[PDB]
Design a protein around this ligand. Structure first.
Ligand SMILES: Nc1cc(-c2ccc3occc3c2)cc(N)n1
Ligand SMILES: [Cl-]
Ligand SMILES: [Cl-]
Length: 330
């Protein structure tokens, strides 16, 4: 698009912030408001235009709800069509939580900073669950959570490009694989609980520095989930279109892993207890003796994460109840 380019006697393009599947995000000066903005420029192809039109509708739907809880979502200032590209104008934010992890050399941030991110993200999910909204983000991951300010720990969620209201589902294959819920891996109709699953994955990663479940493909993904959480419950597998991609039903109505050639730990034996280092000074023992990282602080964190990683989307913890958990009590 080129630095120095002027649009509509209003925006002056400075530089490329980021590239997406959708098109590109540029830094631009708005002469009317007298402020810098992020312009998300959608590719001039029907597929990307039509999905971005849904993104604009969902962001405008959120903006018309003035509540405390709306201010953890990136603000869409406005949108327009230019040279046959849909253009979404956002507030400027800072760098993403993946960059934050990269900057720790993938050793993770403190339990105290993790808690601050968790509380903001739980508040965002509570907003999206407002009945009149019922928005599923569908692509929650560190790259999609941005700091408001490089000096501060305020965050906002970005990228509602995959997002849908409950009962407006388009695609069965959604979420980034590391953050994909068992219900999506199993080809089941999904609801807002898929974001809470992603969040559990994100919070463990923010503290250990490494993805909790880094599958190379869906079969590897489900195997890595099973290593930590065991075989999913029969009542879920009995209703799952894709259960037999991963599991086999026994004579007695019981399920087991499909095994391929080895060259995984037995189901439920890679304990989150050990991944977090609850009784061993935190991830890789690197938090030994630091304040805010006692066994008791760890056990509360472990408890909240295991509720976020319930296999059953029905009983998985919901945003309001996550905000009341002891992990967030002084
Ligand atoms: N909705 C949305 C927003 C952004 C966005 C908004 C403001 C920003 O400031 C700095 C980077 C950035 C990205 C990116 C995408 N892919 N989707
Ligand atoms: Cl990642
Ligand atoms: Cl997606």
């Amino acid at each position: 698009v080129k630095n120095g380019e002027k649009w509509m006697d209003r925006y002056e393009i400075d530089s490329l912030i980021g590239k997406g599947s959708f098109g590109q995000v540029v830094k631009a000066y708005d002469r009317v408001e007298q402020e810098w903005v992020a312009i998300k420029i959608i590719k001039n192809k029907k597929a990307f235009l039509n999905q971005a039109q849904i993104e604009v509708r969902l962001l405008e739907l959120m903006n018309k709800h003035d509540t405390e809880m709306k201010y953890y979502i990136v603000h869409l200032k406005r949108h327009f069509m230019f040279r046959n590209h849909l253009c979404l104008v956002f507030e400027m934010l800072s760098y993403n939580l993946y960059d934050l992890l990269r900057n720790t050399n993938f050793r993770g941030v403190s339990l105290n900073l993790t808690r601050k991110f968790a509380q903001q993200m739980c508040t965002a999910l509570l907003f999206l669950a407002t009945p009149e909204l019922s928005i599923i983000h569908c692509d929650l991951k560190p790259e999609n959570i941005l700091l408001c300010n490089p000096k501060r720990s305020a965050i906002k969620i970005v990228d509602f490009g995959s997002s849908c209201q409950l009962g407006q589902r388009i695609y069965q294959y959604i979420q980034s694989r590391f953050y994909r819920s068992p219900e999506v891996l199993l080809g089941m109709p999904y609801d807002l609980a898929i974001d809470m699953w992603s969040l559990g994955c994100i919070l463990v990663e923010m503290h250990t520095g490494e993805p909790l479940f880094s599958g190379a493909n869906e079969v590897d993904q489900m195997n890595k989930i099973v290593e930590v959480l065991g075989i999913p419950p029969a009542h879920i597998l009995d209703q799952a279109p894709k259960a037999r991609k991963f599991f086999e039903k026994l004579p007695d109505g019981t399920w087991n892993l499909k095994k391929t050639k080895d060259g995984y730990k037995p189901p439920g034996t890679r304990k989150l207890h050990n991944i977090l280092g609850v009784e061993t000074g935190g991830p890789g023992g690197r938090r030994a003796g630091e304040s805010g990282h006692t066994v008791a602080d760890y056990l509360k964190f472990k408890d909240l994460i295991l509720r976020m990683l319930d296999y059953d989307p029905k009983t998985r913890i919901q945003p309001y109840y996550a905000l009341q958990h002891s992990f967030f009590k002084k």
